[PDB]
């Protein structure tokens, strides 16, 4: 028993020291890498918060163009609120079940 348990805690400490040597460098490098990398990530994502445009007519400042487009999408959503029945999805999902019924018939 005792000579087999000793040989198990022997190999446990060997398997630990072979990791500890390599974990300690990585841990001493942790947060000074993390916070540089997070500063880089948020700054890099700001370069993608910027939709591309081709041959749209636009008048002055891009916020002032969005302000006037907003005043008209504030009529388009309000008109889908004047047009969407409580079953618009069930109707829109039936589309191809109707065609497979016809294909079977």
């Amino acid at each position: 028993r005792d000579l087999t348990l000793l040989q198990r805690e022997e190999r446990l400490r060997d398997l630990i020291e072979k990791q500890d040597e390599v974990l300690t460098p990585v841990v001493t490098s942790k947060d000074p890498f993390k916070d540089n990398y997070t500063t880089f990530a948020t700054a890099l994502d700001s370069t993608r918060h910027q939709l591309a445009i081709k041959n749209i007519h636009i008048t002055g400042n891009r916020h002032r163009y969005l302000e006037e487009l907003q005043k008209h999408l504030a009529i388009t959503k309000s008109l889908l609120e004047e047009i969407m029945p409580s079953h618009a999805s069930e109707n829109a999902e039936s589309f191809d079940t109707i065609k497979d019924l016809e294909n079977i018939v």
Partner: peptide, 27 residues
């Protein structure tokens, strides 16, 4: 960073409900 616009969710809602209304009347 670029100052954002509340228009994103409006482009999504107007696209999606216009697409459901399109498919509804197609169906």
């Amino acid at each position: 960073a670029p100052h954002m616009s509340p228009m994103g969710p409006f482009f999504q809602f107007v696209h999606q409900s216009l697409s459901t209304c399109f498919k509804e009347l197609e169906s």
